[PDB]
Design a protein around this ligand. Structure first.
Ligand SMILES: Cc1cn([C@H]2C[C@H](O)[C@@H](COP(=O)(O)OP(=O)(O)OP(=O)(O)O)O2)c(=O)[nH]c1=O
Ligand SMILES: [Mg+2]
Ligand SMILES: [Mg+2]
Ligand code: NA
Length: 385
DNA sequence: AGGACCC
DNA sequence: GGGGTCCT
């Protein structure tokens, strides 16, 4: 009545898979996908040579001299594949939540229940798992929660087979009773495998983490807070004072993350649907000062207008984002947004009006005389209607 | 407009 | 990096 069956689907090395498919000459070769000076991801043949995700490019060559690099700055193809994955999952069950370009959650509860109603009860004893059971736990076929999670593992196997057969992509899946545990357990056997978590092994999974930052929803800021309070292990967080936690983190963070530490997560799988925003970025070391900016902003706009135009919906808010330096200081970018004028929402002719909007938002932020040094320009369209 | 989080 | 999400 309360218990869900959730699957987390997590594609392997995603950008590298897409590049490997584009150029099968790279299939047997160690491969990294480069963005500026970063190897943002690499295929499992590069990982075996000590190439790590988000390793810089000199370190990466220094580790594996023969490593092949492919430019991954233009995300168009990865983004297109990513939506082909999500739509394929949506055909299984429509409630699909995207997390970045390579992870999806699906709530399988209704689908599991319909499949169980189809079984005759002399076939119920015949239910088997597909893939790994976390911690090698024994299955009890008389336990309705175990039966539901096994049928979840069968649907997950079907999704994985369909993504390989229809899109050429491999990935892992985790099946569990909520999104936290599904995300945690999907990564236990990789690459290209799947795992199911039965309820009795939840504490073993959560305590398998080695630090609280590994819990999804606890990020850099929050972990740094916790560390300062002497909270380091999952058990530290489980046993820490609710009241002190509430004072330090506010009631919202405190109550939610302490529930995470126990494996409890009541958040629903939300149907992502079409995106809420479209943006593009470009990074540089001080290659923008000044009115080398309008050109860059023109190029970003050019590309973004194609995306909105192919999307079909129209954006009512535009935003310009910059980043300043130096020297070694703080993360924060700065932005300005305003509505797009009504006549302009009708996709020189579109460019000159939008660039002029953008250049004005530009001035509001940057004093074009007595100037400051830029490391990033980004345009974002949002408020899609 | 900026902050936290996610990939 | 080069994207995204939602909340304050
Ligand atoms: C975390 C992260 C991922 N990405 C991109 C590169 C990846 O192909 C996609 C990576 O998301 P992930 O699922 O973290 O990684 P993956 O698909 O590369 O690797 P793994 O097999 O362990 O799952 O996101 C970034 O560009 N910046 C980031 O900070
Ligand atoms: Mg992932
Ligand atoms: Mg992945
Ligand atoms: Na985390």
């Amino acid at each position: 009545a309360s218990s869900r069956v959730i699957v987390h689907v997590d594609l392997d090395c995603f950008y590298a898979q897409v590049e490997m498919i584009s150029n099968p000459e790279l299939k047997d070769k160690p491969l990294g996908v480069q963005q500026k000076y970063l190897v943002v991801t690499c295929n499992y043949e590069a990982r075996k040579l000590g190439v790590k995700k988000l390793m810089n490019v000199r370190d990466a060559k220094e580790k594996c001299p023969q490593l092949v690099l492919v430019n991954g700055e233009d995300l168009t193809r990865y983004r297109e594949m990513s939506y082909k994955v999500t739509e394929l999952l949506e055909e299984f069950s429509p409630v699909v939540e995207r997390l970045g370009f390579d992870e999806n959650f699906v709530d399988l509860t209704e689908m599991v229940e319909k499949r169980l109603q189809q079984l005759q009860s002399d076939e119920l004893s015949a239910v088997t798992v597909s893939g790994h059971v976390y911690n090698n736990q024994s299955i009890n076929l008389l336990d309705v929660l175990h039966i539901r999670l096994l049928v979840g593992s069968q649907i997950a196997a079907e999704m994985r087979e369909a993504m390989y057969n229809q899109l050429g992509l491999t990935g892992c899946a985790g099946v569990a009773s909520n999104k936290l545990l599904a995300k945690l357990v999907s990564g236990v056997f990789k690459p290209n495998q799947q795992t199911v978590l039965l309820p009795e092994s939840c504490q073993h999974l959560i305590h398998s983490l080695n630090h609280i930052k590994e819990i999804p929803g606890i990020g850099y800021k929050t972990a740094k807070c916790l560390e300062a309070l002497g909270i380091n292990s999952v058990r530290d967080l489980q046993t820490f004072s609710p009241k002190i936690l509430e004072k330090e983190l506010g009631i919202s963070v405190a109550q939610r993350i302490q529930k995470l530490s126990f494996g409890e997560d009541n958040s629903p799988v939300i149907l992502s649907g079409p995106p809420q925003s479209f943006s593009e970025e470009d990074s540089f070391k001080k290659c923008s000062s000044e009115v080398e900016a309008k050109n860059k902003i023109e190029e970003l706009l050019a590309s973004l207008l194609n995306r909105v135009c192919q999307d079909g919906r129209k954006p009512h808010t535009v935003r310009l984002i910059i980043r300043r330096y130096s020297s070694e200081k703080h993360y924060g970018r700065e932005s300005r947004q305003c509505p797009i004028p009504s006549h302009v929402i009708q996709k020189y002719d579109v460019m000159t009006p939008m660039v002029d909007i953008l250049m004005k938002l530009f001035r509001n932020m940057v004093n074009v005389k007595m100037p400051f040094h830029l490391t990033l320009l980004s345009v974002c369209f949002c408020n899609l209607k």
